[PDB]
Amino acid sequence: RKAGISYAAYLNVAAQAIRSSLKTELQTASVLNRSQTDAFYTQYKNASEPTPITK
Amino acid sequence: LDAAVVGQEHYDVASKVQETLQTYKSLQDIIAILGMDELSEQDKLTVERARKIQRFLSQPFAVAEVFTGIPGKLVRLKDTVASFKAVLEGKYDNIPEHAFYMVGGIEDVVAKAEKLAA
Amino acid sequence: LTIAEYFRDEEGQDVLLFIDNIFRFTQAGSEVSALLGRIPSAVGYQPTLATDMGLLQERITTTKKGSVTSVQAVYVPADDLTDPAPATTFAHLDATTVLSRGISELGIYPAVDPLDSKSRLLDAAVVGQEHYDVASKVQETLQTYKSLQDIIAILGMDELSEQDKLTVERARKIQRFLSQPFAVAEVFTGIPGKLVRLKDTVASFKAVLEGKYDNIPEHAFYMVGGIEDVVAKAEKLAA
Amino acid sequence: LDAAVVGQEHYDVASKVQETLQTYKSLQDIIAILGMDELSEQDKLTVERARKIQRFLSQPFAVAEVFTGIPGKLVRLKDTVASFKAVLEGKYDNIPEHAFYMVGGIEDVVAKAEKLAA
Amino acid sequence: GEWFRDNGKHALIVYDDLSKQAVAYRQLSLLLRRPPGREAYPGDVFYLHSRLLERAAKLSEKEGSGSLTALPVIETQGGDVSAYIPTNVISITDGQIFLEAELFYKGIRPAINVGLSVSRVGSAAQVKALKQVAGSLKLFLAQYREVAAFAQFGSDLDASTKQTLVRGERLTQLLKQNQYSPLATEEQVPLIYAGVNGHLDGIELSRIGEFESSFLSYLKSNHNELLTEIREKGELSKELLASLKSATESFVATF
Amino acid sequence: ALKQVAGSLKLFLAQYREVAAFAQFGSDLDASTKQTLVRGERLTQLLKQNQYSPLATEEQVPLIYAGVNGHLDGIELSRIGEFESSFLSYLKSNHNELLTEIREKGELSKELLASLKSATESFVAT
Amino acid sequence: ALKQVAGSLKLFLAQYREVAAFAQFGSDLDASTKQTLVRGERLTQLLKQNQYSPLATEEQVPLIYAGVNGHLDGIELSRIGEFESSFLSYLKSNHNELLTEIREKGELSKELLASLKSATESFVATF
Amino acid sequence: LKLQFALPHETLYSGSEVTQVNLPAKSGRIGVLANHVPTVEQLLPGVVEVMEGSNSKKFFISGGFATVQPDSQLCVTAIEAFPLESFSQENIKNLLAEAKKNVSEAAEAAIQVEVLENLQSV
Amino acid sequence: ATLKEVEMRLKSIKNIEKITKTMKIVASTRLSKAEKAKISAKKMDEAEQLFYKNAETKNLDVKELIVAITSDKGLCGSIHSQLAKAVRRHLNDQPNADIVTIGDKIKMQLLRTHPNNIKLSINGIGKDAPTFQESALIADKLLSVMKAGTYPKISIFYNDPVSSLSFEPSEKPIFNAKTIEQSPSFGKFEIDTDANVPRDLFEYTLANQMLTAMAQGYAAEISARRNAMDNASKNAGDMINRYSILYNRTRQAVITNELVDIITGASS
């Protein structure tokens, strides 16, 4: 997973599995909050610079 | 504005156009206090649709050309119904903000959206 | 007013006069005034709003021969307490009784609001330092209870400062204790009504305000008369 | 209040004082409800300046000595302009606001500012 | 209408509307130069309407038990119910049905504002069968108002209040109605019963209407005995209730 | 010659307050909003005018083209005053061609506007 | 005599009640004007009056002297009414010579001002 | 042995005395003795069995880290940890297996395969 | 002056007063939620930092990366402003740092003052309670687009929720792969020299301790919004009472004046 991702991502990828294969019966309100994010990122120079991609 | 008088399809379109626009007016104290980000994913969609709808009601009149410069457009009733139904059913959610504004029928809306590329 | 007056002047009683609704006495005065053709005054009321009130309210007083006490239903135009109608009326008021669907919705009868209702006579020189002191403390206790409800509703009963959970527990008692079964209401309720004499009321609540009956269950104080009926009721609750 | 009766220099000072005081007025309710914490940093500054300005326009009156408890001052027109020009130029932002309360000209502010030091 | 009321018969009178009559009354008076009052109405504009509306009454046994029931109508300006004439009449009648243009455009029709509407007679003149299933509905819709405009920005939803939104949106949608399509009470109670008892929480909102439809005719074909008993007794027995629970769930599952 | 440079200048100043009330509850400024706020702040400013001081139409026309077409946006808001007096003194010397053309024919050609495009860019770096 | 001991109390209280308005926090408890917040509550307490208790002008200035100058910033808020009756009785018996001089002079000489001063700290040490 | 089992969201064991903890370090299954040597090991996904004498609660684990302190403490830090009593009634594992690995996006869809076909090994 | 104007002013005030008195309660709905993720956060701090405590890990002195945490959502007293303070205070002792801003209000607070420094910016944040998935990806992008693991120092900035009534802007270090090795007591541990434990533990820690800051900063904010709306809806309530007097007067003088106008119109 080199020339590529990181230990923590590489760990989050497996972390979704536990949550998304816990029976819906108790996949809870707070539990789904953990399994998706709304975050975006925009790089900067001097005022803004490049594009605002999703995460 | 009665199904008996105008045809069921007509009235059904006309009513949802009002319901849609009544939601946008109810949501405005929210967007003012919590932005667009706070809206329900379906509310976000309904807000996006209403903007197009509210601009699709803009019409260049003929007598008005001495103000707008734009040639006066005249839309037929069946076009209108079929046009606002299409936009309701999400078939134009990709076409830009300005495209729907100050034109005639749905045909004209396509012409605006394209010419905003060159 | 005249009928009840006779009972003071001739039978020498303490008489009760209900007027329901006194505001309607004002708007009729206003109607007659208008029709006669008298220039209307502020907000359209009759130029004689105050003296019209006087010729009535003044007749309601205590004389050497007896008294006439008036319980007056007061409508308040537009919820505006400064409107000439209620403004004029209030000048003649010695107390208020506020029945409330807020109290009602708690199953507390009669539905008097213990905070809202007010008496120009809840004063040491009139009631005596005895009465007044229990009176204030009930009002202070029930008051801090009301203000803390926000945190009781979302932070649980657990998170009150050491003394506050004792006042709320006592306030909850006092709150129930303030309900009463009525003798008239029997034919709909079944529960035997109780005329609680004042001396008993003060003492019964003084006793609670000292915490002598902290142990006694809460459902007990509810729909009984004076203190003994709590003792009686609490002791049927084990059986 | 024209530049060609009072001087352009005199005119400009009072103008911006008014600008400032109208901005503090334009925010009065935002503040009264939500406090200083919800204001952009520009605004927050023009409010800190205007609050000084508003107290600086209050003056001990000779005839009002019985009410003030303070000796009465009679600032000169030329004095008044220069003083307020300086405050507009930011020269006295660090100084306590209360040093501006009930004084004469600019020198009285500093004179009293030190009285408020120790 | 009184001819009926006086002879042990029942008339319903609709005054459409008393806003316009009051204007007409003002017209005479201003023109006869009779003394004017607030908003130039005659000093007794109140009595014009209270004289009229007290004539609607239910009568004693000794007098025929005849009844005149009045449905007066007042138009408001911008919903302002504190206006001179509206308040006059609001204070005369035994209750309001306040309709709101807000709700109207939303699609909620009739646009009854549950908050500002009452029947001061209350239950005493509701079909017991209906009072049985329907009771406290107005109060739920009450708390549902608050919470819905408290979930507006509250995206944090405890299963308690979120579930209560579902009950709210369903009862609200059930109470929508086409014009000129009044229902019988024996059609109304089985419909409200399903609603209040959560049987509708599972069904998605867009199909509440088609539910009313299939459920009624299903009940008509299959569970007709229940409806007949609702109509002839206007009460619900514990057996009659059990039959209603069953037939609801029987249908709900099949659709 | 005024109508042409002043098209939708009123409708634009109308969409400017609309965005100024969006920034009233101060949030992040994007490609659209940070553009029109900075623009409209400078037109509002440009339409400030001293009393007892009317301007000829050949004076109004360049100033409005200067403002509307976007040659004022990178200039400090506080300096537009001196821009008015300075850009006019500049135009009176060199581009006197433009001003007496604009005065007389009252219109604008595709050629005249081309020269007005130049002169304004030609005075941007002082 | 009153005017002299009341020095900027009028102007003070309006300042205190304004300070106590910005006292909404809380997480920002000040050390500076927090002492005017004590004075205030002390002086507020002092001016409170039972109906039908009009005190003589001589019974007034000692109380106000104790407030203004600050011989009250230590005393608890629930015992200022006590301090009042306790301090009048004390003066009535002990320093009656002052109470008679205030009534008859109408002024306060520095000799009578320092005389009051002493009797104030004297009573403060004992409460 | 003392234990701090910590998650971002939940906090299972804090300070208390579990007698033996089993772990999945990289290429090493550790059963941490009551007095083990100071180690810092990376926890692959797997079962973290805590033994409290005659007891054991397994937890399937997202990943994380384990460190044995010089005071013989065990610090097991993970993202997700659930007791087996209600871990999984779904069974859309194979719905991800062939879904990921069959796509040649490329960098991470292939990366999401490596774990799933390993996770359900019990 | 006009009943219309007073009618509108009374409505927009009472409306504001619903907005704020509900955000006050939407906060308390979220208040218990805030203590879950708050202690759980401080709990892993005790668990995950105790290694570094024991390894005596400190900054190699051999160019900083500063990470500021707040939110996109305002109306929370001085959460944003006084973290910006403490970050500027810090930017005096080392001006040349790169700034990564998480949350839109700290972005523009800091964009006002040091617009050259900010070099990456994370959006759509304050909305829920913070998560590892968020953290880890922002972490991943920090490694990728920012080259975090080349920095002599890395700093996290957040507000630490001291009480329910007050908060405190604090700062914490993240040590990189090299810095973990050259710690004095790193040898005390029998880390298997095989895998770069120092690389992976850094990457894991960077993500892990951003989430701790996020969970904490989040909690303090909720309390700031609870308290700010506590004050706002009390001021608004106070305005309402005043204006309800002004409405009621204008209500009446408008009835009086119309009537005088009418009554005058028949003076003849």
Judged by 3 or more CB pairs under 8 A, whether A touches G is no
Any CB–CB contact under 8 A between E105 and chain C?
A: no
| Architecture per CATH, G1-127 | Up-down Bundle (1.20)
Bridge partner list, H31: H22
Peptide bond into G26 cis (omega under 30): yes
Q: How far apart are CA C115 and CA C102, in angstroms?
A: 12
I229 close to I27: Cβ distance less than 8 angstroms: yes
Comparing alpha-carbon positions, the chain I residue that sits nearest to E38 is I259
Instruction: Name the nearest CA neighbour of C149 among I226, G24, I235, I25.
Output: I25
Buried b (16+ CB within 10 A) or exposed e, E195-221: bbeebbeebeeeebeebbeebbeebee
For residue G110, count CB atoms less than 10 angstroms from its CB and return exposed for 0-12, middle for 13-18, buried for 19 or more. Answer: exposed
Q: Which of E120, E167, E170, E207 is catalytic?
A: E120
What's the half-sphere exposure (Cβ side, CA atoms, 13 Å) at I230?
15
CA angle D56–D59–D61, rounded 5-degree value: 175
Bridge partner list, E69: E12
Instruction: Name the nearest CA neighbour of G98 among G56, G69, G59, G125.
Output: G59
Bridge pairing between strands I98-102 and I64-69: parallel
Q: How far apart are CA I193 and CA I198, in angstroms?
A: 10
Name chain F contacts of B33, Cβ cutoff 8 Å: 25
Cβ neighbours of E162 (radius 10 Å): 14
Candidate from C39, C80, C154 with C-beta closest to I251? C80
Sign of CA dihedral E201, E204, E208, E214: negative
| Architecture per CATH, H1-87 | Sandwich (2.60)
CA distance I130 to chain D (A): 24
3-state secondary structure of H63: coil
DSSP letter at C11 equals S
- How far separated are the first and last CA of chain D, in Å rounded? 41
CA distance A48 to chain H (A): 28
Any CB–CB contact under 8 A between I54 and chain H?
A: yes
Candidate from H63, H87, H91 with C-beta closest to A14? H63
The full length of chain F comes to 126
Bridge partner list, E110: none
3-state percent breakdown (helix, strand, coil) of chain F, nearest 5: 65, 0, 35
Q: How far apart are CA B43 and CA B25, in angstroms?
A: 12
Q: How far apart are CA E105 and CA E125, in angstroms?
A: 31
Any CB–CB contact under 8 A between I41 and chain H?
A: yes
Strands (E), F1-126: none
Lateral strand order in the sheet of C14-19: C14-19, C66-72, C62-63
3-state secondary structure of C29: helix
**What is the per-residue DSSP string for chain E?**
-HHHHHTT-EEEEEETTHHHHHHHHHHHHHHTTPPB-GGG-BTTHHHHHHHHHTS--B--GGGT--EEEEEE----STT-TTSHHHHHHHTTSS----B-HHHHHHT-SS-B-TTT---SSGGGGS-HHHHHHHTTHHHHHHHHHHHHTTSSS-----HHHHHHHHHHHHHHHHT---TT----HHHHHHHHHHHHTTTTTSS-GGGHHHHHHHHHHHHHHH-HHHHHHHHHH-S--HHHHHHHHHHHHHHHHH-
Q: How far apart are CA H91 and CA H23, in angstroms?
A: 25
What is the phi/psi pair of residue C19, to 5°?
-120, 120
User: For the packed helices D77-88 and D41-56, what is the interaxial angle rounded to 10 degrees?
Assistant: 160
| Architecture per CATH, E127-255 | Up-down Bundle (1.20)
Taking CA atoms, E169 is separated from C141, E115, E187, E202, in Å, by 41, 16, 21, 12
Comparing alpha-carbon positions, the chain I residue that sits nearest to E84 is I255
Q: Give the residue range(s) of CATH 1.10.287.80 domains in chain I.
A: 1-25+229-268
Active-site annotation holds for E231: no
Enclosing H/E stretch for C53: helix C49-57
Bridge partner list, I168: I160
3-state secondary structure of C72: strand
Contact residues for I4 (Cβ-Cβ < 8 A; gap 6+): none
E57 close to E68: Cβ distance less than 8 angstroms: yes
Amino acid identity of I5? E
Q: What dihedral do alpha carbons B75, B78, B84, B90 form, nearest 10°?
A: -130
Bridge pairing between strands I118-123 and I98-102: parallel
Name chain C contacts of I251, Cβ cutoff 8 Å: 78, 80
What is the phi/psi pair of residue E96, to 5°?
-115, 155
E and I: number of Cβ contacts within 8 A: 28
The full length of chain D comes to 118
User: For the packed helices C164-177 and C198-209, what is the interaxial angle rounded to 10 degrees?
Assistant: 160
3-state secondary structure of H69: coil
For residue E50, count CB atoms less than 10 angstroms from its CB and return exposed for 0-12, middle for 13-18, buried for 19 or more. Answer: middle
Q: Where are the alpha helices (DSSP H) in C92-225?
A: 101-104, 124-127, 129-154, 164-177, 186-189, 198-209, 218-221
Contact residues for H28 (Cβ-Cβ < 8 A; gap 6+): H41, I192
Cα C224 → chain centroid: 18
Please report all neighbours of I, defined by 3+ CB atom pairs within 8 A. Answer: A, B, C, D, E, F, G, H
Q: How far apart are CA B22 and CA B45, in angstroms?
A: 14
Comparing alpha-carbon positions, the chain C residue that sits nearest to E39 is C44
Taking CA atoms, D114 is separated from D51, D68, I156, in Å, by 20, 21, 42
Q: What dihedral do alpha carbons I216, I222, I224, I228 form, nearest 10°?
A: 170
Q: How far apart are CA F55 and CA D23, in angstroms?
A: 30
What's the half-sphere exposure (Cβ side, CA atoms, 13 Å) at B71?
4
Instruction: Spell out the SS3 assignment of E149-210.
Output: CCCCCCCCCCHHHHHHHHHHHHHHHHCCCCCCCCCCHHHHHHHHHHHHCCCCCCCCHHHHHH
E168 close to E141: Cβ distance less than 8 angstroms: yes
Bridge pairing between strands H28-32 and H20-25: antiparallel
Radius of gyration (C-alpha) of chain E in whole angstroms: 22
Please state the domain extents for chain H: 1-87, 88-122
C145 close to C168: Cβ distance less than 8 angstroms: yes
Q: Which two tokens stand for residue G32?
A: 């500076």
A13 to H93: CB separation less than 8 angstroms, yes or no: no
- The experimental method, as deposited, was X-ray
Instruction: Name the nearest CA neighbour of I225 among I42, I71, I7.
Output: I71
3-state secondary structure of A37: coil
Q: Which two tokens stand for residue I237?
A: 């309530």
Q: Which two tokens stand for residue E197?
A: 């008892």
Bridge partner list, E13: E70
I263 to C150: CB separation less than 8 angstroms, yes or no: no
Amino acid identity of C42? A
D56 close to D96: Cβ distance less than 8 angstroms: no
Name chain B contacts of E106, Cβ cutoff 8 Å: 19, 22, 26
Bridge partner list, E10: E67
Resolution in A: 3.2
Q: Does domain I1-25+229-268 have CATH number 1.10.287.80?
A: yes
Taking CA atoms, G85 is separated from F15, G80, G115, I167, in Å, by 71, 9, 20, 46
B33 to F25: CB separation less than 8 angstroms, yes or no: yes
Taking CA atoms, G96 is separated from B49, E134, G4, G116, H16, in Å, by 89, 81, 20, 11, 74
Place of tokens 């209403």: B50
Instruction: Name the nearest CA neighbour of A8 among H114, I131, I207.
Output: I207
For residue E59, count CB atoms less than 10 angstroms from its CB and return exposed for 0-12, middle for 13-18, buried for 19 or more. Answer: middle
**What is the per-residue DSSP string for I99-118?**
EEEESHHHHHHHHTT-TTTE
Which option is the CATH number for A1-55: 3.40.50.10310, 3.10.20.90, 1.10.540.10, 1.10.1620.20? 1.10.1620.20
CA distance I234 to chain E (A): 18
3-state secondary structure of F55: coil
Q: How far apart are CA I72 and CA B39, in angstroms?
A: 15
F38 close to F31: Cβ distance less than 8 angstroms: no
Enclosing H/E stretch for A12: helix A9-19
Q: How far apart are CA C198 and CA C182, in angstroms?
A: 16
Q: Which two tokens stand for residue E160?
A: 């308690």
- F1-126 homologous superfamily: ATP synthase alpha/beta chain, C-terminal domain (1.20.150.20)
Q: How far apart are CA E3 and CA H111, in angstroms?
A: 89
I203 to A43: CB separation less than 8 angstroms, yes or no: no
B19 to E106: CB separation less than 8 angstroms, yes or no: yes
Q: How far apart are CA I130 and CA I33, in angstroms?
A: 11
Name chain I contacts of A40, Cβ cutoff 8 Å: 122-124
H2 close to H13: Cβ distance less than 8 angstroms: no
Buried b (16+ CB within 10 A) or exposed e, C11-22: eeeebebebeeb
Bridge partner list, I173: I155
CA distance G17 to chain I (A): 17
Bridge pairing between strands H13-14 and H3-6: antiparallel
Place of tokens 């003012």: B32
Comparing alpha-carbon positions, the chain I residue that sits nearest to D34 is I232
Q: Which two tokens stand for residue I93?
A: 């002792």
Interface of H with A in 92-111 (CB under 8 A): 92-93, 96, 107-108, 111
Any CB–CB contact under 8 A between H40 and chain A?
A: no
For chain D, domains (ranges, CATH) are 1-118 (1.10.1140.10)
CA distance D45 to chain I (A): 14
The full length of chain I comes to 268
A15 close to H63: Cβ distance less than 8 angstroms: yes
**What is the per-residue DSSP string for chain D?**
--HHHH-HHHHHHHHHHHHHHHHHHHHHHHHHHH-GGGS-HHHHHHHHHHHHHHHHT----GGGHHHH-S------HHHHHHHHHHHHTTTTSSS-GGGTTT-SSHHHHHHHHHHTT-
3-state secondary structure of C190: coil
Taking CA atoms, B10 is separated from B15, B74, D102, E177, F83, in Å, by 9, 19, 73, 20, 58
Bridge pairing between strands H13-14 and H50-51: unpaired
Q: Which CATH class is domain I26-228?
A: alpha beta
